[PDB]
Structure formats: C-alpha cells, structure tokens
C-alpha cells in the first residue's frame, strides 16, 4: 500500500496566522488523487480539498491545496479559531485507500509547566484486592509530556494507562491523568510510590511521591 506521511506531527499557531501542512506519499499520486479532511473531537471527518487542489462545496476560500507527484500541501491563509483541529490527507490513486497519520493543528501559547499531583489508593478500593495509584499533570503546554512510575525506585512498565484532555478553549493548556494498577498483594509489598514527570516547562523532571503506611 501507499504510505502517506504528514508533517509536522503538531503545528502550533495563533489565529490570524498562515498554516502550511504537508503530506508526502511513498509513491507518486499524480496531480489528482489526494484529499484533505478536518476532524474535530466527537465528529466525523469533513472533506476540505479533493483532486489535490479543488475546494469541496461550502469550504471557505482560506483553504487551498497544492502539489503533485509525492508532495502535497494544505494551506490555510489566515487561521480562524474554528480551524484548530486534526487534519488528515487521503490518497486514492490505488487500492487500498490510505490516510496520513494526522497533523494536530493546535493553539500556540507560552510554555506552561504542569502542576503535578499523586493520589494514593483509597482504603475502600483496597478492601477489594486492587490498588490504583493516580498521577495528575494539570494545565500544561505544549502537549508532549512523559510520566514514569517508580515503585521503590523500580521503573514500572506495562501496568499503567493514561489519557489526555482536549486543548482547553480558554487557556490553551492540556491535562493528563495516569493510573498505575497493582494487586493489593503487590501494593503491600512496597513502600515508595512515585510519579516522575518530564516536560519542556520543567528545568528538570519533577517527582511526586508518597510512602504506603503514612498514606
């Protein structure tokens, strides 16, 4: 299959600025067989451009598409607040149809370090044989952040899940929650529970921790 690679992974701009999004195909698509879509959270994709350069019905003139062969570009001449969304290219020069991995067009703002919080499991939960430990990274920018869980300095893997909020419409930040899950048996084998956070707004990683027994 033809692979489409979009760049940049995240484009960070302000309303009023010009946005240029790139799609590179692993083989030639001609000057036609490429479309661009916009997608917002909870909604279906919306067609913007077809035939590489043609605007779909009702799409404003600030959207345009160009390119041929392997290299295609979507331009938004002057960003509106409603344009901040994820964008995908799609090729249809041969089967199967494939899409790029998406470009996140987000609102740029000053760097903001997260406020970091760790929460021990409740006694209520412990009653039932499971312990969940939760780490909150609150109101940070940009979106890239890394959480590492340590249990008595042992770096954990495979026993955590996380999720991230959509960029806030007022303050342009993100927040992230990570949950470490362990059996009550394992939880009680150890003392120090820590979450280490790495982020551009932090001169060095910040760790929040507690000791089981004092919490």
């Amino acid at each position: 299959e033809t692979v489409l690679t979009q760049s940049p992974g995240t484009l960070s701009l302000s309303p009023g600025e010009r946005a240029t999004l790139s799609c590179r195909a692993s083989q030639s698509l001609g000057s036609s067989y490429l479309a661009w879509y916009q997608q917002k959270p909870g909604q279906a994709p919306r067609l913007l451009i077809y035939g590489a350069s043609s605007r779909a019905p009702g799409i404003p003139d600030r959207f345009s598409g160009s390119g041929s062969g392997t290299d295609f570009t979507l331009t938004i001449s002057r960003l509106e607040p409603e344009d901040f969304a994820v964008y995908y290219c799609q090729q249809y020069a041969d089967s199967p149809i494939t899409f790029g991995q998406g470009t996140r067009l987000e609102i740029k703002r000053t760097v903001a370090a997260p406020s970091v919080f760790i929460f021990p499991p409740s006694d209520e939960q412990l009653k039932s044989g499971t312990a969940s430990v939760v780490c909150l990274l609150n109101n940070f920018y940009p979106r890239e952040a890394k959480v590492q869980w340590k249990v008595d300095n042992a770096l954990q893997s495979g026993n955590s899940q996380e999720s991230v909020t959509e960029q806030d419409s007022k303050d342009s930040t993100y927040s992230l929650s990570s949950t470490l899950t362990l059996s009550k048996a394992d939880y009680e084998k150890h003392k120090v529970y820590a979450c280490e956070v790495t982020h551009q707004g932090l001169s060095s990683p910040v760790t929040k921790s507690f000791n089981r027994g004092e919490c």
Binding site: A44, Q90, Q125
Partner: protein, 220 residues
C-alpha cells in the same frame, strides 16, 4: 437535507461478529459508492472497503479481506458492514460515507459513526473512589482532589461536582478501556490550597445503563 444515518452503538464479545447499517436519505440522485472507514479511539482513519449499491459489488482493503463483508439494499437505500472474528483491535467508531462519484475517491458526506466495543463485560455500575492528597507542601499555591470512577460498563458516565454547582477548574478525563473489558475514568478539580479543608467537594456519578447514581465526598 442529504443524510447518512447509522445504527446504534454495539457491544460484542471477542470472536463474535457485528453488523452496522447506514441509511441514506435526501439524495437527489443515489450515490454510486458508499465507503466504510473506521477509527480506533485516539488513532487515525482506516478505510475498510466500499460498495456500489446498484450492482451490489463490494471492494475491500486486503487487510480485512475475508473478515469484512459490505452489502447493499438499494431498495431501502441502506448499506451494511459486517465484521467477523472480532478482536480488541476492532474497537473503533465505524463510519459510512458517500464518495464524489468513484470507488477510489474522496468522501463528501459522512454518517454520524457507530461505536463498536469488543468486550466480554456485562453492564456494571462504577465503584467511585476518592482521589485525595496524603500530603501537600506549603510551596503549592494549588491543590487537587478528584474521584476515580472505576470498573464500569458500558459507556458513558456523567460526572459532576457539587451537584453541578462546581464547574470551573474541573477536568473529567477520557475513560480508558482496561484489559478486564471494563472502563475507568478520573475526574479532578484544582482549587486554591486554602480552599482544601475549608470547602466541601463531592463528586456525583450517574451511570444510566446500570441505573446507578453515587455521590462521593472527597476527603484526605
């Protein structure tokens, strides 16, 4: 109004099969081709195949060949996507979309999507646990509290704070489907440190499928 209306959310066990429908209405001329595209939560778009209703001829992405069947009922302007041998990787929103004219083409009208969740779980109300700090330094101008809304099925839950009186500073996170096949979600609020211990914070969790309503006052 040109519209593609899909059938409702589905839950199926691993190994089973699912059929989703898409009813077209409001087209002056019926579409030559309906395509099916899916998207796993947080991931990209994946085209599955399409069908030409007037001849009921489908085409497929080879990675789904032999597991996906797309059919058309031209008489009811409906198409169907059936996917068999379901695995966890098939949990996704499934969209139908009509094309600009051809099989290999751009897609201009889209259905609302159908969520298909592959889980062995039965309906189950959440357990609601407090998220409360055990310690908090004086160099912290803000504090956080929350609740962990654990082990429920299916989606959604609705989480409010102080019976809906508290909305500022709240983040309710996307749920994660756990390897157990149950969901878990957290909802947190950040407050000035001086409000911790002088004000009361209660999370209210409503899970309609299990007719569950739980209030949890969050304290250290």
């Amino acid at each position: 109004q040109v519209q593609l209306v899909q059938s409702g959310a589905e839950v199926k066990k691993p190994g089973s099969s699912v059929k989703v429908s898409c009813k077209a209405s409001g087209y002056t001329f019926s579409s030559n081709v309906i395509s099916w595209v899916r998207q796993a939560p947080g991931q990209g778009l994946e085209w599955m195949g399409g069908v030409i209703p007037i001849v009921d001829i489908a085409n497929y992405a080879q990675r789904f060949k032999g597991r996906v069947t797309i059919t058309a009922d031209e008489s009811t302007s409906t198409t169907y996507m059936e996917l068999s041998s379901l695995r966890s990787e098939d949990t996704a929103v499934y969209y139908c979309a009509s094309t600009l004219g051809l099989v290999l083409d751009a897609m201009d009208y889209w259905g609302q999507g159908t969520l298909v969740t592959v889980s062995s779980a039965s309906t189950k109300g959440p357990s609601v646990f407090p998220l409360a700090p055990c310690s908090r330094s004086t160099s912290e101008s803000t504090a956080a509290l929350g609740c962990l809304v654990k082990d429920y099925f299916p989606e959604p839950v609705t989480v409010s704070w102080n019976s809906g009186a508290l909305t500022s500073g709240v983040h309710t996170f996307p749920a994660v489907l756990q390897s157990s096949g149950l969901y878990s979600l957290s909802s947190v609020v950040t407050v000035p440190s001086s409000s911790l211990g002088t004000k009361t914070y209660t999370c209210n969790v409503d899970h309609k499928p299990s007719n569950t309503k739980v209030d949890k006052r969050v304290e250290p």
